[PDB]
């Protein structure tokens, strides 16, 4: 399955002028476009080799539309300030994410479109793509306004049509990078933290896409409660890294096994100390 995702962040700056607007576009776990309101460019820019192909119409259009996004968010900040009766001397944040997922048959699988205000769910399109989830009363006001204007229809038209179309286009053009799978290079490290304890760390490196699962078992018993699991992180070269660690009594190393699951592996991998 594949996905196209657009992310938008607008942060109000009391006194510092107009809000900071940042937009990014992703195909799966690969960014391809960006826009920064504070940049001298004032253009939608390429961030992937395979999007540079697109002609002037593409860039002009996306620039205009993303600027429209910036303006709409800019108004949204004031509107929401009104909804919540908030002061003009505090910074606030509006976030919007939307996009589409296609399945193995490269056809529409899912669609989404959601807004958050100050780190918190504000309004979201439901899975049926024709109703709204509003987390509070203000979001209910928004919901009334969007229902009266039939936003969900146009939105569904975008999600099921244009979004999928351009997703398939991008997937075709950047197939070398987007339609690839890099199996994780796995290993385990052992380092005494004390006379009686040792840190066992299970590593997965150079994998794509980012989805992966690392779990520790002690004599077959899952050890998630006592496992330090870091957030999957980018290597910088388009691949990802992740590790999971457990602190064990020295001498018990052979009881512990690491378990790695990734779509690049023909089957789940088990690493062990013997």
């Amino acid at each position: 399955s594949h996905s196209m995702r657009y992310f938008f962040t607008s942060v109000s700056r009391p006194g510092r002028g107009e809000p900071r607007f940042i937009a990014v576009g992703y195909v799966d776990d690969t960014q391809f476009v960006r826009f920064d309101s504070d940049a001298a460019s004032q253009r939608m820019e390429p961030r992937a080799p395979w999007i540079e192909q697109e002609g002037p119409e593409y860039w002009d259009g996306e620039t205009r539309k993303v600027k429209a996004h910036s303006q709409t968010h800019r108004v949204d900040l004031g509107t929401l300030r009104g909804y919540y009766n908030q002061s003009e001397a505090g910074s606030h944040t509006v976030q919007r994410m939307y996009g589409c997922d296609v399945g193995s048959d490269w056809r529409f699988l899912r669609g989404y479109h959601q807004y958050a205000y100050d780190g918190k769910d504000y309004i979201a399109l439901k899975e049926d793509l024709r109703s709204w989830t509003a987390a509070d009363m203000a979001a209910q006001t928004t919901k009334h306004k969007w229902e009266a204007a039939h936003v969900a229809e146009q939105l569904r038209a975008y999600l099921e049509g244009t979004c999928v179309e351009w997703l398939r286009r991008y997937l075709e053009n950047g197939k070398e990078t987007l339609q690839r799978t890099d199996a994780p290079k796995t290993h385990m490290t052992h380092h005494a933290v004390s006379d009686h304890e040792a840190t066992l760390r299970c590593w997965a490196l150079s994998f794509y896409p980012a989805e992966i699962t690392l779990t520790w078992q002690r004599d077959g018993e899952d050890q998630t409660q006592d496992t330090e699991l870091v957030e999957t992180r980018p290597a910088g070269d388009g691949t990802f890294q992740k590790w999971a660690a457990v602190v064990v009594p020295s001498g018990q190393e052979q009881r512990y096994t690491c378990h790695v699951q990734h779509e690049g592996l023909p089957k789940p991998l088990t690493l062990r100390w013997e």
Partner: peptide, 9 residues
């Protein structure tokens, strides 16, 4: 490409 039809909150 991104969505061209926008509506305020």
């Amino acid at each position: 490409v991104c969505w061209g039809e926008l509506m305020n909150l």
